[PDB]
Each structure stands twice: as structure tokens, then as C-alpha cells.
Design a binder for this molecule. Structure first.
Ligand code: HEM
Length: 214
């Protein structure tokens, strides 16, 4: 259209469906994910968000990213660390897995963070705006399914405590994106990188899936 925000939303409409329909994402929606599989995604989110957030601290002051810099509001690193300690034990840093589908995603994140920063925004957008436009169902089914004891831990990642209204924030973010300066080329690329994002995720589920069935 004419809004960076409306462009992406639409551009990734199809791939998003591809993401939803993943064999591992659908088994989840239908609430049939074992503690093992759930323990895999948490370990995936951790590696992705550390890379993501790390590259964000690199371009925090950069004009290409500064406008969407919201550390308190969004940063998930600490949230995932807390969760991962519950899921793997005080030794999670030592035990947790690091698969090749995780490695690609992390690798892409850094290439972008250093040679194509103007694109970092597409990933931030996908991760943060994604898990903010829909983190309720991910929690709703997470809760019921796993039915872990009354431990009160392991799912912090799903609660952005520093945002009262998701509605208003998602609105501030789109405003800030739409305010990002970028040449027609860069724009088409950023949109293209948002697709890249989804493919890294979709490719991730599939790899976590084959991993379960062993
Ligand atoms: C159970 C699986 C999923 C379901 C059913 C789901 C559902 C949705 C829904 C209904 C919205 C609100 C869209 C709107 O009305 O504007 C949304 C937005 C979005 N989702 Fe998901 N989603 C899922 C998986 C994913 C995955 C894996 C990602 C990737 C990180 C993701 C990224 C996004 C993004 C970026 C948006 C917002 C786009 C925008 O605001 O322009 N979603 N999702």
C-alpha cells in the first residue's frame, strides 16, 4: 500500500498461514505438545531472542533502528532465561540444545545486524509484534496442555509486564516503523526479509518436529 506497516502485514499474510499450519504448530494448537517439545521451543526462543536483542543493542542508536528501540517494553532475554531455568534446571546453560534450524535463524540475525541493519526492523517486527498480536492463545493452550504443577514459572516469556495496553503499543510501534526512513529498494527488501523471518520459523518447527519423532 503506502504504509510500511500495512505493507508487511499484507506481504506476509500467506507465509503466516504456512507458519500456523506447521506440523508442530498445529499439534500445539490442538494442545498435543509434550513437555519435551515445549522444552524445545523455549530453547529456540532463547537463542533467537539473544541474537535478536544482541544485534538490537548494536544498532540502538542507529537511525535505521532507533525509532523502534523499546528495551523495557519488549526485551525478552531475561524472561526466557527465567523460563529456561525452570524447564531445564539450574544447569540449563549447559544442557539446552542448539539445533541447525536454530543456528540458521541466529546466523541470519547477525548477518543482518552487521551488514544489513536497515533490515533488523523486519525481524524485531516479526518477533515482537508477532508475539504481541497473538501471545494469548499461545499461553492459553500452553497452560491447559502441559498442565505442569502449580509452579508459577516457565511461561514468563509470554507476559510483557511493561506494557499495559498491547493495543496502544502495537499502534505506537507501527507509527514508529512508518516513520523509518528507507529507499524504495530497502523497503522492498525489508518486506522481503519479513518473509525470510517466517521461513526461518517455519523451517524451525519442522526441524523441531522430526526431532520429536525419534
Ligand atoms: C497458533 C499460531 C498462530 C496463530 C493462529 C496466529 C494468529 C495471528 C492473528 C489472528 C493475528 C492478528 C492479525 C490481525 O488481525 O491483524 C496475528 C498477527 C501476526 N502474527 Fe501470528 N499467529 C500464529 C503464529 C505466528 C508465528 C509463528 C509468527 C511468527 C513469529 C507470527 C507473527 C505474526 C505477526 C508479525 C503478526 C502481525 C502483523 C501485523 O500486525 O502487521 N504469528 N497472528
Amino acid at each position: 500500500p503506502q504504509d510500511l506497516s500495512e505493507a508487511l502485514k499484507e506481504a506476509t499474510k500467506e507465509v503466516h498461514t504456512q507458519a500456523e499450519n506447521a506440523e508442530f504448530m498445529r499439534n500445539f494448537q490442538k494442545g498435543q505438545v509434550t513437555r519435551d517439545g515445549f522444552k524445545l521451543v523455549m530453547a529456540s526462543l532463547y537463542h533467537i531472542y539473544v541474537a535478536l536483542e544482541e544485534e538490537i543493542e548494536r544498532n540502538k542508536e542507529s537511525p535505521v533502528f532507533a525509532p523502534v528501540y523499546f528495551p523495557e517494553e519488549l526485551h525478552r532475554k531475561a524472561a526466557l532465561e527465567q523460563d529456561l531455568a525452570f524447564w531445564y534446571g539450574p544447569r540449563w546453560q549447559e544442557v539446552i540444545p542448539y539445533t541447525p534450524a536454530m543456528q540458521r535463524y541466529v546466523k541470519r540475525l547477525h548477518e543482518v545486524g552487521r551488514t544489513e541493519p536497515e533490515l533488523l526492523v523486519a525481524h524485531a517486527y516479526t518477533r515482537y509484534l508477532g508475539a504481541l498480536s497473538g501471545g494469548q492463545v499461545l499461553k492459553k493452550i500452553a497452560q491447559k496442555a502441559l498442565d505442569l504443577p502449580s509452579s508459577g514459572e516457565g511461561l514468563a516469556f509470554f507476559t510483557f509486564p511493561n506494557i499495559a495496553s498491547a493495543t496502544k503499543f502495537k499502534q505506537l510501534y507501527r507509527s514508529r516503523m512508518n516513520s523509518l526512513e528507507m529507499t524504495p529498494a530497502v523497503r522492498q527488501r525489508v518486506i522481503e526479509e519479513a518473509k525470510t523471518a517466517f521461513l526461518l520459523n517455519i523451517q524451525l518447527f519442522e526441524e523441531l518436529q522430526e526431532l520429536l519423532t525419534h
